[PDB]
Design a binder for this molecule. Structure first.
Ligand SMILES: Cc1cc(C)c([C@H]2C(C(=O)c3cccs3)=C(O)C(=O)N2c2ccc(CC(=O)O)cc2)cc1C
Length: 123
């Protein structure tokens, strides 16, 4: 049985760079996938998209659109201390949080900073 860690590493292996917004999306997909016992179908959709010739980035976006736990789901809230706990390559993707953010519209997660600041990660 594929674990959350295994799937994260499988997906990371297809991505360029490090700590990018797509890396965080992998984290969110794996976390929510584990919590809903859906790692197997997520892995299968990921591999099927690649086998079709989609880029790995496209494959990850297609997951948020084709795997039902992500359809019209809100991004998860992640509590962090400061903006510096967010990876460097994610910094320019951080945005003010919109009224009703959705994962399948590109809102990966929402960071809640300890001082009350909030930032959404947008792809
Ligand atoms: C709600 C949520 C979502 C995620 C992706 C994580 C990640 C994650 C996170 O992306 C960041 C923390 C500081 C900057 S980004 C972690 O550091 C982390 O360990 N997360 C994570 C990912 C998958 C799982 C599932 C599992 O492997 O059991 C559990 C935790 C933690 C939490 C609490």
């Amino acid at each position: 049985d594929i674990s959350a860690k295994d799937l994260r590493n499988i997906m990371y292996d297809h991505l360029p760079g490090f700590g990018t917004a797509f890396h965080q999306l992998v984290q969110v997909i794996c976390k929510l996938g584990k919590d809903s016992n859906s790692l197997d179908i997520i892995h299968a959709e990921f591999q099927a998209s690649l086998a079709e010739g989609d880029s790995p980035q496209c494959a990850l976006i297609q997951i948020t659109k084709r795997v039902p736990i992500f359809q019209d789901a809100a991004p998860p809230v992640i509590h962090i201390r400061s903006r510096g706990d967010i990876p460097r390559a994610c910094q320019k993707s951080l945005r003010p949080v919109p009224p009703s953010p959705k994962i399948d519209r590109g809102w990966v997660c929402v960071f809640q900073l300890q001082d009350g600041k909030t930032l959404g990660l947008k792809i």
